[model samples]
Target chain A: LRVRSVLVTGANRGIGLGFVQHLLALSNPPEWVFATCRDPKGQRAQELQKLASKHPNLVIVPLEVTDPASIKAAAASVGERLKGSGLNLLINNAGIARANTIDNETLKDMSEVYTTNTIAPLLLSQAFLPMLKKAAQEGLSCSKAAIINISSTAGSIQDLYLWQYGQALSYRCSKAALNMLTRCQSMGYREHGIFCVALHPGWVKTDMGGTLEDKSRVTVDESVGGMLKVLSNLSEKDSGAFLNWEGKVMAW
Target chain B: SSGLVPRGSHMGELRVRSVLVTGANRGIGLGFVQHLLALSNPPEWVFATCRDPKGQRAQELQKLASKHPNLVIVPLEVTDPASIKAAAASVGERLKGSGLNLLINNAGIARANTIDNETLKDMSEVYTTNTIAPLLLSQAFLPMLKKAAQENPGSGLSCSKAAIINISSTAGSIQDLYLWQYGQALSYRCSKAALNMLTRCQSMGYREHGIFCVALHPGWVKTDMGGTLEDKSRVTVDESVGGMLKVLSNLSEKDSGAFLNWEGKVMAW
Candidate 1:
């Protein structure tokens, strides 16, 4: 399938790392797995650095969504490196969440929250659109490309009130926004054979998820495994919808 | 902040109050103010805000203020926090501590650029003004609403009970493959989509606080942003606004944090 190339954002740790690990183990794998993080040399990103050393397919790239220039530069670098090759799947997995109440929080908090969580994915998508189009033209798998947005049930208004215990306003809102972008992109790219879908990783156990979480938590292995399975099964009809780790249709 | 409710029309008189439209300087914003003003009893207060406090639209609004004695023109620039804070303070002070019963976050922009052609800086500009600004405004004014409710106890017009109407579009919905495909506005789509979620989060936060926030998609309205003519299926601004206002007026507390279409039906997330 036209030499697959996969780019995973926020691949330093958590679910992103899991996706990278799974991708590395796939048959034929990707020609190159662009695993990106805000800082390529940070202490927490050591595991990813080690993984890159062990696997020839893995290449570490620096990506900070809030900085538009940085994103542009990273995309340019990746595109140039790929040369004639094109990207198959781009996974948006980077995000941040803080528990800030509306009355107490400042604009600084909201901007930081929204910029990284929502804007980064869209900006990155724009930066990589040309490469995506190139991949489609080269007759890649399915004769198109895909963008997988890592969203959450927290962003779902229908189930948001179901359990009002956790209120990460900025995070929730940003993901909701990401879901919309996914839909919009899905709409725009269908003719181009570029499919976009938003996925809820469920309450996965990660550093951000804390060591001891609720009973409903899914392990990183289980979550990414299920998510990849869902992606492999996605059809044109499922392109714009939000899906859960269990493959259920999540409400918007 | 002080309600200049015409005699017989008390501060907390209107069972279903009138509107408070922002960006009333001109264009679609002015259209919102003009239409709301023409209402029979009008709203208890049409708190019209614009960037240029002395612009022609403000002058027109001022004339309406003088005539209706209820319309008040305030200044607001979505990009400026201080401007928003000041406007909120003035609205708070003028209401004599009585807060806005309804708020329409109609201020937004549409930059014409394709994903490949658009600049990151321009994208940031759109995100800050269109998405983050509304949250800042809502945060700044929420407390005043709480205070207003306390002051008007036993009065049916509970200040705590307020509605926040966000102007969104079907273009913002994630499920409509056709919409985003037709319009490849990365920044605009992202901001609007994020605004939808922000509405949900804010709604989650404020429902207990007694404020219901909802995002409404005013179909393809013929406006400067919607353009003077319809892109595909065009509806007049007046018609869209009328439909939106009807939806806004009839919104129950249960509708908070929900995204709705022009038909008052829920839009796909």
Candidate 2:
């Protein structure tokens, strides 16, 4: 991996856990891999804890991505550990979904999903910009300093041939707004030489993307490996791009 | 989310008989009401709504109502479901057995936020206003809209029967944002983008009910929410509202589920 230090949020399970495992297994692994979950010691993160025990480079951090205080605390802890090395990659992967239809979607569901999926990514990026800028100043390439917002195909307003078939109104709207955030950050951070891109991990065999029993879904390992390969190959011309796990551009 | 628009000179005018506009106490919302009233063949009932009709803020809307009996000033807090339901019931009572032909979800609020400083609280409020309120308003007013659609037997869905016009913004365009260095109002931009999606879903969901839906950017009007008067780049309230009236008056089935400029030009999603 070109990046020296990386952080993955919601690293207990699903694509997030897969990302941490894949990065750690790399032959030229990141020097520091920070895996964040809502709770690191709880039963929810037992697998992450086991991995932390085995790898001295794998540091487990607890981050409530939506809470400002919790984010600040996590940032302070990470900064202390980095010793000014800076965070090269910040992966915003903590998101929740509710199947809210047009007729029944409520403020609770919509706002909760927005705070988690859309707003949390923006907040995390803001809190981590100094570190990213620091990384960008040292390494003059996008592969070295970047932000990856895990978005979805459902967020594509132009690809709504399936609009009649989907039911997650709140989820769809949140992700669409997240894409706009990614676009904005791409512009705002370009002066600092930090790249911002939204990534879509193909429907994987995880909790959010069904389970391992599902035959049609791609394994989480496959999705993570595809993403790592794509991220590693990104160049300056690819800044602000939205790409799928298979390294193809997607409609905004 | 859809295809090309076939914009041409509008050969017709707004044929809707009854219209309901929210946030009509001031700004573009008030402009919408004023434009409707000035029309040569206006709707029979132009229901203008605000958070409080009897409060100090709605003095202008109340004055407008006194001059024209057709202008019924309604009290509505768009964020509150009880308020939305009550406003719908009151309007339905006034209409008797008739249906509302046009529903304009014009009520919205803006917060000073950017990509770096946006918070969960402000975004939730912004989304509730710019996005969720329109959805709830559409639901509450569906019966009246259905009645109006049933009353008019058009070959296809048109605003003349029953239609919803969501007041959106050019800031809602995600594809264009890659180059837009301004409009750093993050919460506002996100909410408007979400509003466009709601408009898309509504257009698809209500097609079977014979109702048209379109998300409209009313231009950068010199309203309090838009910009200051000294900012010459912004259009006058009359120009923006007049252009929106022209666009709204000409909507067909093809225009539904579209993001349009006030000039009736199509915008990217």
Candidate 3:
């Protein structure tokens, strides 16, 4: 609850934007809320622009998750603002999906999806490790420094119930790999006092989550609200865990 | 070690008339070809593919092919689309109307470094070969597997009819991720986990066609990609390949979508 700084990627709309809204509305909000998107000036981010105008703590930075130069520049700019404090929480919320099955999956589609969904999160985390470690060292709680990779139930290898809805081959495989990344970082970064976990946001109404024909869809408010609550109560025991927005542990 | 793999001597039961092993120029891949040739009633056609059949890397495969009439050296670069398509066509053309009986996706690459030191190049390279290539190869050869299954329709489905064996690893087992003895190797681990999903999804997709598919763990072998000589626990190429041949022959519809170790034990997905 005492965490001072938070950063969320892909914050133009949907769950990412929802997190920014809830974080800024907190009675004792973090000193800084960094919201990164691919294009902050574009019309698609108009809602985000409106929020940026109202909250001084909300900093809108442009970032292309797959581009190394963009990640480097974004890190430097955010570092300048934090000065010596370092980052307290990192929510890797950026993700993409492609429609392909075992029958039609192409190398290009699979590669692109893996690059964004699986590889980019690791790159961003590596770029921000120095700050994450600094914040962790300063405090005793797992919440002091953590990385929550926004993952999905589709990533669960043991449970293939999602395949009944759509094959989404590339999307499913990438998220599965992302979960492995979360598990590895959770172990390796434990020595550094940084906690890492993969979180599955229940199917929500978003461009990527697709049309809400299914009754399982939750609003962005409902999903991110539950997630923030879970993040606020995190302990060292939760590190390397696969969890859902409902605060339940998930099988890998 | 409660569910340790059993020693399988079921290799003689295998009746595969046509088989293709990818990256079969050296190491375990080559070992697979040599064993297939040693079978009592070995496969009628043993297609061993690599990036170059005449190149220095394939000298050993070529040596095996010289005296063995059943062995055929086919050029294939696992990650290249053109190469995959060309290899599929060559195999299809050679199989005539009978169809390919077994496809051992033995080709794979890895970056055995720690998660902190893993690189994009290594991750991408390993994923392309270890994960994506299997799916592409399966897609390219679907018709043949379907044909083989249709032709060999029996009282029960079995690998002798048709099957896909994806070379997976214990490193990719998400349920038990801490394998410090094998180093972190994030990229390699991720690729295999993804490959397991492919096997599962393919099982779902291919069930109607009667084609069996499964992910296989070849065990920690003392090969170029496995570990150094100091690791005494590692199995020999002969032990691993011999066990795998027996395991593959023993597969049935019940085993499809399952993750099996080289010695025929089940691995967690």
CA lDDT of each candidate? Answer: 0.74, 0.84, 0.86
Rank by lDDT (best first): 3, 2, 1
Q: Where's the lowest-lDDT run of ten residues in candidate 3 chain B?
A: B3-12
Query: For this target, which candidate reaches the highest TM-score against the unseen true structure?
Result: 3
Estimate TM-scores for all models: 0.86, 0.93, 0.96
State the DockQ, from 0 to 1, for candidate 2.
Answer: 0.65
TM-score of chain B for predicted candidate 1: 0.84
Winner by DockQ: 3
Superposed Cα deviation of residue A148, candidate 1 (Å): 1.8
Q: What is the C-alpha DockQ of each candidate?
A: 0.60, 0.65, 0.79
For all candidates in order, state the fraction of native interface contacts they contain.
Answer: 0.66, 0.62, 0.75
Question: How good is the docking of model 3, by CAPRI class?
Answer: medium
Clashing pairs in 3: none
Query: Per-residue alpha-carbon lDDT of model 3 for A34-127, expressed as tens digits?
Result: 9999998799889999998998989999999999899999999999999978898999998998877778899999999999999999989999
Candidate 2's residue-wise lDDT over B1-269, tens digit each? 36443342353577878999999999999999999998888789999989767889999998898899899988899999899999999999999999999999999998766666777788788988898889889989999998998898665888778999999887878776521555578888888888888888788888888899999888788888875646556778788888887777787898789988877888887
Candidate 2 residue pairs in backbone clash? none
User: After TM-score superposition, what is the CA distance of residue A3 in candidate 2 from its true location, in Å?
Assistant: 1.2
Best by lDDT: 3
lDDT of 2 by residue, A146-207 (tens): 99999987777766524654667888888888887887788778888888888889777777
Interface RMSD of each: 2.2, 1.2, 0.9
